[PDB]
Design a protein around this ligand. Structure first.
Ligand SMILES: O=N[O-]
Ligand SMILES: O=N[O-]
Ligand SMILES: O=N[O-]
Ligand SMILES: O=N[O-]
Ligand SMILES: O=N[O-]
Ligand SMILES: O=N[O-]
Ligand SMILES: O=N[O-]
Ligand SMILES: O=N[O-]
Ligand SMILES: O=N[O-]
Ligand SMILES: O=N[O-]
Ligand SMILES: O=N[O-]
Ligand SMILES: O=N[O-]
Ligand SMILES: O=N[O-]
Ligand SMILES: O=N[O-]
Ligand SMILES: O=N[O-]
Ligand SMILES: O=N[O-]
Ligand SMILES: O=N[O-]
Ligand SMILES: O=N[O-]
Ligand SMILES: [Cu+2]
Ligand SMILES: [Cu+2]
Ligand SMILES: [Cu+2]
Ligand SMILES: [Cu+2]
Ligand SMILES: [Cu+2]
Ligand SMILES: [Cu+2]
Lengths: 332, 332, 332
């Protein structure tokens, strides 16, 4: 009887940060209550000032990471305020039935709904909007995020021993398809209905104009670089709701990687790069061994360095000359 | 001595259905006899009426699924009737030697041939036509299918326990490259020789115009939706002879997935989405837990919903409100 | 104390050949000394005579395969002669810290540097140039190779039993983005600075003009086909520094495949085709069972047969009619 279970309300945080949770479950199964408010908003996505009409869960691209344990119930109140213009819904890849919830969550502006589902499978999973007939438009306008369903006893390595992260980050990677005129400049539009056919045309090229982390070129750099210290264990959850990606930590590795995100499987060890298929979340665990700047990229390096799919870590601590050193510095 | 082995003749069926077979082998090794007749034919591939000249095994895109057991011999009579115009052959990825059989099976119109090979490795595998100098044209004109080589003791899970499917379906996914003029409309052609250079040009864009299941937009929908019942165990074999895909069951999972199709490996568990590389067949096993409509898609959602890579399941049975429920239906 | 370790100097060879080494380490950990000299040079990459300005390690595309054992130190002297025009560096995906070495190895023309790193993880790994702000241009101009870090006790199968190769080859796969004018012909350029914006434009299409093995269409064919004999065990290391590939041996298999290249993981068995993500090296082990010609391809068959990603093996020995035979040769 679900009404006999504890309820716990989660207050979500903006990516790449993750709401507080416990890796090993400290209670029995719970109904974990989340609320998200859909926001259609203008977003500047590149250094040139390109502005799109984004479609967001909770004001961010990606939407926030939700965290529960296996066999918890996820109860989401989804709000579509009347200041939005479009119908929206939500599909959880973690859920079973009704198109992941999408068939049960269609909300016009001015409406809300509450969905509950049992998180029966452990892993990281995509969630995304999926309105019938408009699915890729919403997804590729930023309307996607992820949920992590932890095993009740936390993560385990390939031998069944615990893996405990000290920090966790959520990198959502977004492919945008900003319509281009025949000279190659972006078009912007006066209403969503006026934009729809050229959005479809742009999407049908299968060639993103932008591929970004955390909603914009450079979002995970500078004052918003990811951080760690030498010796810290970091889990990086990475999602891509629509298109393949190949994450890579420049100067590091994925020590343990669930490339397709499902924790009942043993992780892949010692990865340089891994393939997260479109429509999937993956997770990589790494223990930092060197300080300095790292780049975290999609290792299609055109996608990374020309289209935007690159962020930074700033890592503090002691340099290990045994692992790496300049024997003779660059010189004539 | 192969002549001392039983022979069994298989009568193939049209995808997505699969000819009758036994998961666990009920006999010793056999020579399993198949016949396929090549058919070049016009096919309408989309709702707009776009018509291509398809190149088929047995009249369908994809060609039919062949099913044998490990260490059976596959003996294929391949017929190229004189009503066709082109040379064709067949390459089995399941086979060893002679370019998978392609070097031994070149048939002009009016010819036939019989190839035998030993199915030494268990898995699902692509087969496709591959005429020297014309390989991607034939493949991307629909001339590909798959073969399943079951272990003699049937499928097993990651722990070595049996997995027994109640139903099996074969989804062949086809990328087409219909030539476009500079305004973007399709060109159609008066002979295959007149079409060849612009087919090559279209292919070299690496951008399909259409990506379809079972040969056309919407083929696996409506009266031709896939079906199941709650509690049934379903294996979905999925092939892509030329280009990566990322299957996903909307509202479900791959409970056990051989993403690259080879049954000696343990399956991946609990997948949301999986990557089947171009040139591969994969297989996913799922036990349905909820009734209703599901979409089965390539989770590049542009490829699915704009280019055609989407089908449906219609599932009968009882709804489980513990797994999912609408707590508060959409309302103001 | 690293100065107490043996030093061994390796003399590299041109791909697809691999410098001599021992699978099982015959000594304790060593400092393995390599020297590479950067060469910017014109290269003809296709049958039409298309000429690019390649950026190479040691004069080849790909750069040579380096081979060490786990817990050896790699000490690379990297030389940028004053006959080159650009700044270069090197990033080893095998290494930890300083962007894989790139932050420590920036050499102007007329400079050299020596980097040392500890090869702490076994596998095959990409290395590539990565000058800040110019990364994909250098990589997609050919400035990438691979390093193999063998386990000290050599390779093992999924059950922990030895796998010993008789031959090894290194196939580097290169995506080139030769700029095209609006009629589709290649542009060539008078200086690298004059080429840079249109290189970026070409790259941003995400559509290679050429995808080649060993630096050119047809490089691994004819007198330069790969060779083997029936019964020989062959390891094929395959890298792609920038873009996904899907290798396939036509007429064979990957008997044991590390698709993402990391030897602590059990290999995948019996693969037809496997996905090597951009930014990764993979390795496939096969024992030849039939003589004749094989094609080794990227199984996007457009990429293989139209864009260049195809090579050949020529295999000597006895034909096995039990594995495959023509029962009835093509005839009316
Ligand atoms: O609790 N069974 O999903
Ligand atoms: O933080 N416990 O390993
Ligand atoms: O928004 N960070 O640069
Ligand atoms: O190419 N990735 O969907
Ligand atoms: O080494 N990362 O491009
Ligand atoms: O989902 N396996 O990483
Ligand atoms: O029966 N040996 O392939
Ligand atoms: O249908 N036997 O599990
Ligand atoms: O052909 N089924 O819609
Ligand atoms: O992008 N798949 O071949
Ligand atoms: O949840 N499938 O788009
Ligand atoms: O082929 N392994 O799924
Ligand atoms: O030797 N420790 O990397
Ligand atoms: O060559 N030893 O298996
Ligand atoms: O360079 N071999 O054809
Ligand atoms: O599509 N591969 O980067
Ligand atoms: O069978 N290889 O195209
Ligand atoms: O890296 N595992 O092949
Ligand atoms: Cu929406
Ligand atoms: Cu989805
Ligand atoms: Cu054909
Ligand atoms: Cu093939
Ligand atoms: Cu360089
Ligand atoms: Cu790199």
């Amino acid at each position: 009887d679900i009404s006999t279970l504890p309820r716990v309300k989660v207050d979500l945080v903006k990516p790449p940060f993750v709401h507080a949770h416990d890796q090993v479950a400290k209670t029995g199964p719970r109904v974990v209550e989340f609320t998200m408010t859909i926001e259609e908003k203008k977003l500047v996505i590149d250094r040139e000032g390109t502005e799109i009409h984004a479609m967001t869960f909770n004001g961010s691209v990606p939407g926030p990471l939700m965290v529960v344990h296996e066999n918890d119930y996820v109860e989401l109140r989804l709000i579509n305020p009347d200041t939005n213009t479009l119908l929206h819904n939500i599909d959880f890849h973690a859920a079973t039935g009704a198109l992941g919830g999408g068939a049960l969550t269609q909300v016009n502006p001015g409406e809300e709904t509450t969905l509950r589902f049992k998180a029966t499978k452990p892993g990281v999973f995509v969630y995304h909007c999926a309105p019938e007939g408009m699915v890729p438009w919403h997804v590729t306008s930023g309307m996607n995020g992820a949920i992590m369903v932890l095993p009740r006893d936390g993560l385990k390595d390939e031998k069944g021993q615990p893996l405990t992260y000290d920090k966790i980050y959520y990198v959502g990677e977004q492919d945008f398809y900003v319509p281009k005129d025949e000279a190659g400049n972006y078009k912007k539009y006066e209403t969503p209905g006026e934009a729809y056919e050229d959005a479809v045309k742009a999407m049908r090229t299968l060639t993103p104009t932008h591929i970004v982390f955390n909603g914009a070129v450079g979002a995970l750099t500078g004052d918003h670089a990811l951080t760690a210290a030498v010796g810290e264990r970091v889990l990086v959850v990475h999602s891509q709701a629509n298109r393949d990606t190949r994450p890579h930590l420049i100067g590091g590795h994925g020590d343990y990687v669930w490339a397709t995100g499902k924790f009942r499987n043993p992780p892949d060890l010692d990865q340089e790069t891994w393939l997260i298929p479109g429509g999937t979340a993956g997770a990589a665990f790494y223990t930092f061994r060197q300080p300095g700047v790292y780049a975290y990229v999609n290792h299609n390096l055109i996608e990374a360095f020309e289209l935007g799919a690159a962020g930074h870590f700033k890592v503090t601590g002691e340099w290990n000359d045994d692992l790496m050193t300049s024997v003779v510095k660059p010189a004539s």
